[PDB]
């Protein structure tokens, strides 16, 4: 189909890096959420 | 007539406000139907005729009887839309779906698409009541003199790429309105070309045209007559020039 000019290979690469960064983000965010539950819980 | 309810709480005030709602409904009908004289029937991207032709029906044709024996114009009509219909359009569908653009296939300033689009107005010029042409060069307009402002004539014409292309020669004027519509250029390439005054900013030392760059000033449509200019040529010129705010931007500096 390819509406944007990209092929399955390029898209696989780009998705790999995107999800790398995503899991990094979620890691950092769950860390900070944990620390905040430590400081000022909310449940 | 205070405290006089015909029924329930309904008095002259209520009757009047409701009557107004009704009149207003009819009025929106009237206006949104009279705004249909141009553009309808609705098309697809294929040029066909579509199923959704609006919930308001196209109205019944009227007639404009033109001055100077230019004939009768009927709106809405097939002649009206087919005259002003463009063909041989340099465009390519971006998708089989509808609601997506259509890219210009070639040079758009020339191919007459997008902001650079023009419409086939009739190759007869615009006239005053007396039937004389509306736009005359200031030299044929007997009695016309600059009454104020910066006389641009003879000033260089800086363009969007900051480069210079020529010198102004003459001013084309709306005699019945007494104002300057187009200005002419004596280009380096030995050619004369018009440019709308609304797209040219007279400085003290020059005339700036930030719309288009220099490569474009040469391919501007010309005039088959040097004393008159028709509506068609006007649209072509104006579209070409105005399209540079999009299609020559990679060239525009400062």
């Amino acid at each position: 189909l390819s509406f944007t000019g990209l092929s399955d290979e390029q898209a696989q690469e780009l998705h790999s890096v995107y999800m790398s960064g995503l899991w990094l983000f979620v890691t950092i965010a769950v860390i900070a959420h944990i620390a905040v539950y430590i400081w000022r819980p909310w449940l | 007539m205070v405290g006089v309810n015909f029924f329930g709480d309904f008095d002259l005030a209520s009757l009047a406000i409701w009557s107004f709602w009704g009149f207003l409904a009819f009025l929106i009908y009237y206006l949104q139907t009279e705004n249909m004289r141009e553009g309808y029937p609705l098309e697809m991207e294929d040029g066909s005729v579509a199923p959704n032709q609006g919930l308001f029906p196209v109205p019944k044709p009227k007639t404009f009887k033109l001055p100077n024996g230019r004939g009768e114009i009927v709106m809405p009509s097939a002649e009206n839309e087919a005259a002003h219909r463009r063909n041989d359009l340099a465009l390519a569908r971006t998708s089989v779906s509808e609601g997506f653009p259509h890219a210009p296939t070639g040079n758009a300033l020339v191919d007459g698409v997008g902001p650079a689009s023009w419409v086939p107005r009739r190759d007869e010029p615009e006239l005053d009541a007396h039937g004389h042409n509306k736009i005359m060069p200031m030299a044929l307009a007997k009695g016309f003199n600059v009454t104020a402002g910066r006389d641009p004539r003879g000033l260089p014409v800086q363009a969007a790429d900051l480069e210079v292309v020529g010198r102004v020669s003459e001013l084309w004027v709306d005699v019945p309105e007494q104002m300057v519509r187009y200005l002419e250029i004596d280009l380096n390439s030995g050619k004369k070309r018009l440019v709308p005054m609304t797209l040219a900013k007279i400085w003290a030392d020059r005339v700036r045209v930030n719309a288009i760059a220099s490569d474009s000033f040469e391919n501007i449509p010309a005039t088959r007559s040097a004393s008159e200019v028709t509506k068609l040529e006007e649209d072509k010129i104006s579209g070409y020039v105005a399209g540079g705010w999009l299609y020559d931007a990679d060239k525009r500096k400062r």
Binding site: - | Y40, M44, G47, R86, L91, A129, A242
Partner: protein, 281 residues
């Protein structure tokens, strides 16, 4: 969905932000980055209005009213049930308006036409902001802004105007009035003139700009021109809204008393004060 001429203009480009992402149409409408934003904000504000009136239990569209926090709340954010809804709706409304303007910009540069329209709209956004953002901040509290009710912002107008007596004596208000009246006047005249040329007496040919100029020269000795009247009505509206914003930003910040006492500086000029005659003697 297209008009008989809508095609050759449906080309790509003219986008301040975004690019191919969002360069498409939904029915007649163009939706860019800012179309998405304005839809989101508008929808959210609408749904919040409805929930606010739902919490209240009111469902009549004329009696629905979401009011700002108390004046004692000051400039802090309040509970949703005591001002937070009004505040979020204000946020969303402003985002929606600014995004409408920027959408207009994208379109103006795709169709290659000037940016006069979003400029005009900017003044209206400026006035709305003057009412709900600036004037409060300078007056110290969100609660001095107007509510989102069809028939309640009128009560806000009335009370706010009677705080300073007859607001009629505010001069910037006078100018706003005058420009508004002149705007309606010029609008009617323009429309009537044009229709009278295009649609003349039966059995007569269409008319031209020369006939318009001549008719109004005949009537009042001056004609402003086909371009000048548009210029004029535009400027009239803008200066009206300009004066209207100026009238409100100075009402409770620089002025504090009845507005009538302002004109008494002309009476009280020493060389005609003591004179016993007239109204003020």
């Amino acid at each position: 969905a297209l008009l008989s001429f809508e095609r050759k203009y449906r080309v790509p480009g003219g986008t301040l932000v975004g690019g191919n992402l969002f360069d498409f149409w939904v029915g007649p409408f163009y939706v860019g980055f800012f179309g998405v934003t304005t839809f989101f904000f508008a929808a959210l504000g609408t749904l919040l209005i409805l929930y606010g009136t739902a919490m209240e239990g009111v469902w009549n569209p004329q009696l629905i009213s979401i009011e700002p926090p108390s004046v004692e709340n000051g400039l802090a954010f309040a509970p949703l049930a005591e001002g937070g809804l009004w505040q979020l709706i204000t946020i969303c409304a402003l985002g929606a308006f600014i995004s409408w303007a920027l959408r207009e910009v994208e379109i103006c540069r795709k169709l290659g036409i000037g940016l006069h329209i979003p400029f005009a709209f900017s003044f209206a956004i400026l006035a709305y902001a003057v009412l709900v953002v600036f004037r409060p901040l300078l007056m110290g509290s969100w609660g001095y802004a107007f509510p989102y009710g069809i028939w309640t912002h009128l009560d806000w107008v009335s009370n706010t105007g009677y705080t300073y007596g007859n607001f009629h004596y505010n001069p910037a208000h006078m100018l706003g009035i005058s420009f508004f009246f002149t705007t309606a006047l010029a609008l009617a005249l323009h429309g009537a003139l044009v229709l009278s040329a295009a649609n003349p007496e039966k059995g007569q040919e269409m008319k031209t700009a020369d006939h318009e100029d001549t008719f109004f020269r005949d009537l009042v000795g001056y004609s402003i021109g086909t371009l000048g009247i548009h210029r004029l009505g535009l400027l009239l509206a803008l200066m009206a809204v300009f004066w209207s914003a100026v009238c409100m930003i100075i009402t409770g910040t620089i002025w504090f008393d009845q507005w009538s006492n302002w004109w008494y500086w002309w009476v009280e000029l020493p060389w005609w004060v003591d004179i016993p005659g007239g109204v003020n003697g």
